[PDB]
Design a protein around this ligand. Structure first.
Ligand SMILES: CN[C@@H]1CCc2c(ccc(O)c2O)[C@H]1O
Lengths: 333, 54, 288, 233
């Protein structure tokens, strides 16, 4: 235990010595983006109960959402139509994902099983492709590396990498003290980071299978995670009102996003296409838009009767869709 | 017992790494944002003709 | 005197402005926000639409009639205005009855209420209410089934400069019954049963947590709900049935005064049926 | 072209299916069977049956759906059970002298305090089942560890003036049962604001009428919610 304390002290000292000047000082001369006016272009209706998770398709047109009613609906954002409506074995669902190829949709929740649905089948409209089991906790988030690999983050404090064809855990990742509540993949897909209830965000290497870096930051749990579009930084959301941005190379916090009025938590975080805007949902009924490089609020997104539980920015950066507990999906621009 | 050794080894693995100065990292993020701000439909108001949802 | 006419005009203008403002605010609040779109809120907005129609049609033209002391418009316009007035009054009172019945089904049978009230069912109920209201108003007035065989009435129906209300016994009795008396007894039974349910829940709570600290509220709410409807409309229908029988002569001024006392119920309604915290938040958001 | 027509037809079919599913979903209630371990939750669940465990039972032509979750003191998944009809809390009332280190009853009281004060579980009534009444009666009646040894407030406790006992019982077992009930009721009363209440019940393994108790408690919960919505309570 003595060696661990010395190693932690050395790591903290190295991080402190590496900190030459904070990001706020350097980005002082950058012109602020100014006030941003954003309105609900289309509202997607049909969900029975509250919506937890959503994911934009690679086509930037199709998005899939999950609700506690047991319905997994795939929407056509441009035409506001329902392409598919997949029932689920377990009503309680806390995650969903849409494959990069556009053919597979993943789901999971309190059922402790990651369900994968094949959308390309012609004999049946939608059917379960695999029943990925082995976790002993609720699946907080699932993401697709490709059409044949998936990475999940469960309540077992472990993130696991699965193989679709064979159907078992190829690699598992351990080290989190508390439950893993979010997961986001790097653009190159060789790396990913997972926020945990242990007030620590960790970076994992998919191919090697070993954790690389750990960031302390705040003291409350992490609910949201998202890489910078560059793939070299990421931002976290907390049960505490603080929203923080970390850097992989500097291995420490760069800037923190918080306000005196806000005392609620953060449930969803995503970046704009150019990375200038950090759209972050809140336990409060409204969403917020932060200037990533200056930590100055730009715009406020409001119009949800309940807490915002999901949020995402499409691949081409044209629209933002936030799914709240009001059982409504609102697409902004 | 055995968990402590694993935690110590994990901390040792994270300790041995090269960290570049925060000035360079902030410059890199600022340069990326400045370079790619021209193709961000959210940051700047896209025309209604080019807006797909409108 | 001369000041009296100006005062009456100012009072009528204030009344119509209040009615229009309140009802349009309620309708806008319900329409703008999808949160307020609720099955009972469909009945609420039907009531608001009926009250707005009454305050926009019957109240201003009636005020012009009482101030001018004659009807400047055509003979067809008198019949149309009377039809609109009767339709609005009947629709408003029957919508009050429907709201009461909906609350009865909500508290009395909580399990089955969520299944046998739906958006389609609510729309069917509202359409049926408005059709029933229309048949009592438009069908007799337009086809002249309400016209009475009286010398003064026959003289009034001829000259187009006078537009008063003279009605036969049968139509007046039927219209008063359908408009007010059936909804009155239905709402009385409904609210008595709901008060019984609230009281028994209160005694159950007291038995459960008597030692620890945790029917005034129910009585106050039912008073503010039923008294403002009974006190506003009961005298008008009472004197209607009375003078129609002609046993006790009623002056026309008293009739008009009681009719307008009934009219102001449209303005009073939003202050009684829109005190919910969601409605208050919506009103605060809309105005400042 | 034809893509718009195909999308419209698909949306219409999916909307009809969703309307049917919405009717079926609103016609059924949901309950969360949440309680401490080895407290008899399995026994009571089997009595009502007649990763997660879901059991569906209907009484008086009303559909009830129950979910039992199975893994640490921290509960972030508890936010998934907002807007449920009720939370069924089963506790081994006889385990006033046990180690769960800590008294089992004290741990259950702490769990009840955490659930009652949870922000997301607000406006959610809790149905309380004081399971294992017979074991409690056997313990208190026989010469054994006293309640005052583990719960200091029991010495100053007195039997409430309500004094509603069963057909046959002893004064000591009645005092113990009512003190155990009143601890939970005192925890429940302070934090509540009239939105949600706690319904206590003394049940045993022999009893098999708990379906009726759950049905009546749910009926009272929905009735009280409706009455408070209209401001008549
Ligand atoms: C012109 N004033 C009318 C006369 C009779 C009448 C009214 C309202 C409802 C009815 O059921 C009636 O029979 C009054 O508003």
């Amino acid at each position: 235990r003595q060696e661990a304390e010395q190693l932690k002290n050395q790591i903290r000292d190295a991080r402190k010595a590496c900190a030459d000047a904070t990001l706020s000082q350097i980005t002082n001369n950058i012109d602020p983006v100014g006030r941003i006016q954003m309105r609900t272009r289309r509202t997607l209706r049909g969900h029975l109960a509250k919506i937890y998770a959503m994911h934009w398709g690679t086509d930037s047109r199709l998005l899939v959402s999950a609700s506690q009613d047991g319905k997994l609906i795939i929407w056509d954002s441009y035409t506001t139509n329902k392409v598919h409506a997949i029932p689920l074995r377990s009503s309680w669902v806390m995650t969903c994902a849409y494959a990069p190829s556009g053919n597979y949709v993943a789901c999971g929740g309190l059922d402790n099983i990651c369900s994968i649905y094949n959308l390309k089948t012609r004999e049946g409209n939608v059917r379960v492709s695999r029943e990925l089991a082995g976790h002993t906790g609720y699946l907080s988030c699932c993401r697709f590396l490709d059409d044949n690999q998936i990475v999940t983050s469960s309540g077992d404090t472990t993130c696991a990498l699965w193989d679709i064809e064979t159907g078992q855990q190829t690699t598992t990742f351990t080290g989190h003290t508390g439950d893993v509540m979010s997961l986001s993949l790097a653009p190159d897909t060789r790396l990913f980071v997972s926020g945990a209830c242990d007030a620590s965000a960790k970076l994992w290497d998919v191919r090697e299978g070993m954790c690389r870096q750990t960031f302390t930051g705040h003291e409350s749990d992490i609910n949201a995670i998202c890489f910078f579009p560059n793939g070299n930084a990421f931002a976290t959301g907390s049960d505490d009102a603080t929203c923080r941005l970390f850097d992989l190379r500097a291995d420490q916090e760069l800037m923190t996003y918080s306000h005196d009025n806000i005392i609620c938590g953060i449930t969803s975080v995503s970046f704009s296409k150019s990375g200038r805007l950090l759209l972050a949902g809140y336990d409060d009924f409204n969403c917020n838009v932060w200037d990533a490089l200056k930590a100055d609020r730009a715009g406020v997104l409001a119009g949800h009767d309940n807490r915002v539980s999901c949020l995402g920015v499409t691949d081409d950066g044209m629209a933002v869709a936030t799914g709240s507990w009001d059982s409504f999906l609102k697409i902004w621009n | 017992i055995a968990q402590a050794r694993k935690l110590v080894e994990q901390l040792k693995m994270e300790a041995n790494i090269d960290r570049i100065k925060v000035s360079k990292a902030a410059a890199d993020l600022m340069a990326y944002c400045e370079a790619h701000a021209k193709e961000d439909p959210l940051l700047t108001p896209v025309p209604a003709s080019e807006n797909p949802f409108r | 005197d001369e000041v009296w006419v100006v005062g009456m005009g100012i009072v009528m203008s204030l009344i119509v402005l209040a009615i229009v403002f309140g009802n349009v605010l309620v309708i806008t609040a319900i329409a703008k926000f999808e949160r307020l779109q609720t099955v009972t809120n469909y009945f609420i907005t039907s009531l608001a639409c009926a009250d707005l129609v009454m305050g926009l049609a019957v109240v201003p033209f009636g005020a012009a009639h009482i101030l001018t002391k004659t009807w400047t418009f055509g003979n067809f316009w008198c019949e149309f205005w009377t039809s609109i007035d009767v339709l609005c009054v009947t629709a408003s009172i029957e919508t009050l009855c429907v709201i009461a019945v909906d609350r009865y089904f909500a508290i009395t049978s909580p399990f089955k209420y969520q299944s046998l009230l739906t958006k389609n069912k609510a729309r069917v109920i509202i359409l049926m209410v408005w059709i029933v209201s229309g048949l009592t108003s438009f069908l007799p007035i337009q086809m002249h089934w309400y016209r009475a065989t009286h010398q003064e009435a026959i003289n009034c129906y001829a000259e187009e400069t006078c537009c008063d209300f003279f009605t036969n016994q049968a139509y007046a009795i039927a219209s008063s019954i359908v408009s007010f008396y059936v909804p009155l007894v239905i709402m009385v039974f409904v609210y008595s049963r709901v008060f019984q349910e609230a009281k028994r829940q209160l005694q159950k709570i007291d038995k459960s947590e008597g030692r620890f600290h945790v029917e005034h509220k129910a009585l106050k709410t039912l008073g503010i709900i039923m008294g403002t409807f009974t006190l506003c409309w009961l005298p008008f229908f009472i004197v209607n049935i009375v003078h129609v029988i002609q046993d006790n002569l009623i002056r026309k001024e008293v009739y008009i005064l009681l009719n307008w006392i009934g009219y102001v119920n449209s303005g009073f309604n939003p202050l009684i049926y829109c005190r919910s915290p969601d409605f208050r938040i919506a009103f605060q958001e809309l105005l400042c | 072209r034809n893509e718009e027509k195909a999308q419209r037809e698909a949306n219409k079919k999916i909307e009809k299916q969703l309307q049917k599913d919405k009717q079926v979903y609103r016609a059924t209630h949901r309950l969360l069977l949440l309680g401490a371990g080895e407290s008899g939750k399995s026994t009571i669940v089997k009595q009502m049956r007649i990763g997660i465990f879901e059991t569906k039972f209907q009484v008086d032509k009303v559909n009830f759906h129950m979910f039992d979750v199975g893994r640490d003191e921290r509960r972030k998944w508890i936010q998934c059970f907002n807007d449920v009809t009720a939370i069924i809390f089963v506790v081994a009332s006889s385990s006033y002298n046990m180690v769960i280190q800590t008294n089992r009853l004290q741990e259950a009281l702490n769990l009840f305090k955490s659930i009652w004060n949870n922000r997301w579980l607000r406006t959610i009534s809790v149905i309380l089942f004081l399971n294992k009444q017979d074991l409690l009666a056997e313990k208190v009646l026989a010469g054994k560890s006293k309640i005052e040894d583990y719960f200091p407030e029991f010495a100053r406790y007195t039997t409430p003036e309500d004094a509603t006992p069963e057909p046959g019982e002893d004064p000591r077992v009645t005092r113990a049962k009512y003190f155990i009930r009143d601890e939970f009721l005192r925890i429940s009363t302070a934090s509540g604001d009239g939105r949600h209440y706690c319904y206590p019940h003394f049940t045993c393994a022999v009893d098999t009428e708990n379906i009726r108790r759950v049905f009546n408690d749910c009926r009272d919960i929905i009735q009280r919610m409706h009455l408070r919505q209209y401001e008549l309570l």
